[PDB]
Amino acid sequence: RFGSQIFIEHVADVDTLLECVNKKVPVLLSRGMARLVVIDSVAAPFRCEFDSQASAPRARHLQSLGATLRELSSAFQSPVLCINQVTEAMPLGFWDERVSPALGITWANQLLVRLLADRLREEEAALGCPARTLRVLSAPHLPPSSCSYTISAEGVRGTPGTQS
DNA sequence: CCCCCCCCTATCGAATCCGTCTAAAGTTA
């Protein structure tokens, strides 16, 4: 039974997200209802309040959120997946690339495995189909590599024989 | 009253025309 075992929550502020991850996710994880956490965007709440002159409170909030998420994941042996946005690059491993992860080094220090789903739309689009590539940025045990995939009516499928 | 520290962000904005070639078919005392 698929739909009956997926839980949906909605938040609209950084404080709301902090309170939710503090006092709702542990209740769900304690009873064994779920063993997986997905955040559809972490950059969306943060890119609205804190400007370029308020980096200290932003870093404090990011550190607190990362610590809480890592503690929960370690305690309940449940994966945590975070979806992130990108910014424009106008020293951190990004030289021949026009986009970088949004939050910065403070949030990048809290992570374990970093992927980068990319679509090359400006070029090789006249061939008739989109070109989608999933790349491994960093991992303690995974070499940097990439593969190709497509999105169809049934889900995401990886193209065989295309690993870098 | 005493002695030492913190942190990145975010795309924009179109211009500029050139250079000619190849001739064919007689008619009516």
Give the whole-angstrom CA distance, residue A30 versus residue A77.
11
Beta bridge partners of A132: A119, A149
Give the whole-angstrom CA distance, residue A117 versus residue A112.
17
Give the whole-angstrom CA distance, residue A138 versus residue A144.
7
Identify residue A25 by its one-letter amino acid code. V
Beta strands A80-82; A37-39: pairing state: parallel
Give the whole-angstrom CA distance, residue A131 versus residue A145.
16
CA of A132 to C1' of B13 (A): 28
Strand B contact at CB of residue A55, distance < 7 A: yes
Query: How deeply is A154 buried, as exposed, middle or buried, from its count of CB atoms within 10 A (0-12, 13-18, 19+)?
Result: exposed
Q: Length of chain A, please?
A: 164
Q: Which of A138, A120, A124, A133 is nearest to A159 (CA)?
A: A133
Give the whole-angstrom CA distance, residue A45 versus residue A43.
6
Q: Where are the strands (E) in chain A, listed by range?
A: 37-39, 80-82, 86-88, 99-101, 114-119, 132-138, 146-151, 156-158
Q: Which residue has the tokens 């309040």?
A: A49
Strand B contact at CB of residue A70, distance < 7 A: no
Give the whole-angstrom CA distance, residue A17 versus residue A21.
6
CA of A104 to C1' of B21 (A): 68
Q: In whole angstroms, how large is the CA radius of gyration of chain A?
A: 18
Chain B bases closer than 7 A to any CB of the protein: 6-11
Strand B contact at CB of residue A47, distance < 7 A: yes
